[PDB]
């Protein structure tokens, strides 16, 4: 799958905008993914911060949304909404040692609920993304609690998936 790199380290409006344009350019926004081969069904987005920590998000080309991610030797996947997606995601991060599928989905309503106690007033920006990348990475070694993970997913989804999605839709008027 195509790999799209972005770092928060020395990030500008231009570097971030080019990043989102790149993602948007790989989308084929369709109400549902079906007539699409699994060899081009996903976009991989490698995120890294100032701490040099790096995670790779798996984005569905049909809707731009995060279906799962990789952090070093571990891969995490949101509960697939159906059998097609259940086996589609098995083609992601195939060389990773540890694989886990959450029982919950990656939709906003679920994530908001899971962040519950914590995340009000979720601030977006380079700073938050930077911290979100670390949260994603440390989840794999027990350093990140579920509510923090949920908040971190929201940050990534709003700054990446939702940004690309919005630009695609304004792109087609």
87 labelled catalytic? no
Measure the CA–CA gap between 77 and 23, rounded to whole angstroms.
20
The greatest distance separating any two alpha carbons of the chain, rounded to the nearest whole angstrom, comes to: 44
Binding-site positions for a carbohydrate read 3-5, 10, 35, 126-131
15-20: which pairs have CB atoms within 8 A and are 24 or more residues apart? 16/126, 20/160, 20/163, 20/164, 20/167
Strands (E), 29-173: 42-48, 54-60, 66-71, 74-77, 98-101
List the structure tokens of 149.
């993970």
108 labelled catalytic? yes
At what resolution in Å was this solved? Answer: 2.3
| Domains of the chain, first to last | 1-173 (3.40.420.10)
Measure the CA–CA gap between 115 and 38, rounded to whole angstroms.
31
Residue 76: phi, psi to the nearest 5? -125, 135
Length of the chain: 173
In which residue are the tokens 């992601």 written? 92
Binding-site positions read 3-5, 10, 35, 65-66, 106-108, 126-131
* Region of residue 93 (phi > 0: left; psi between -120 and 50: alpha; otherwise: beta): left
Give the active site residue among 108, 110, 112, 138.
108
Q: Which residues of 93-131 are buried (b: 16+ CB within 10 A; e: fewer)?
A: beeeeebeebeeebeeebbeebbeeebeeeeeebebbbb
Give the active site residue among 16, 65, 137, 168.
65
Q: Are 98 and 163 spatial neighbours (Cβ–Cβ below 8 Å)?
A: no
**How deeply is 87 buried, as exposed, middle or buried, from its count of CB atoms within 10 A (0-12, 13-18, 19+)?**
exposed
């Amino acid at each position: 799958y195509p790999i799209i790199n972005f770092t928060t380290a020395g990030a500008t409006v231009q570097s971030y905008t080019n990043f989102i344009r790149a993602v948007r350019g790989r989308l084929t926004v369709l109400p549902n993914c079906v007539g699409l081969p699994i060899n081009q069904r996903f976009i991989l987005v490698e995120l890294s911060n100032h701490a040099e920590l790096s995670v790779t998000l798996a984005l569905d080309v049909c809707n731009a949304y995060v279906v799962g991610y990789r952090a070093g030797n571990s891969a995490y996947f949101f509960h697939p909404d159906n059998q097609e997606d259940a086996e589609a995601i098995t083609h992601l991060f195939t060389d990773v040692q540890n694989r886990y599928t959450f029982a919950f989905g990656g939709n906003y309503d679920r994530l908001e609920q899971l962040a519950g106690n914590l995340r009000e007033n979720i601030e977006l920006g380079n700073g938050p993304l930077e911290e979100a990348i670390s949260a994603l990475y440390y989840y794999s070694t027990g350093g990140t609690q579920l509510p923090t993970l949920a908040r971190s997913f929201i940050i990534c989804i709003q700054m990446i998936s939702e940004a690309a999605r919005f630009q695609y839709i304004e792109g087609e008027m």
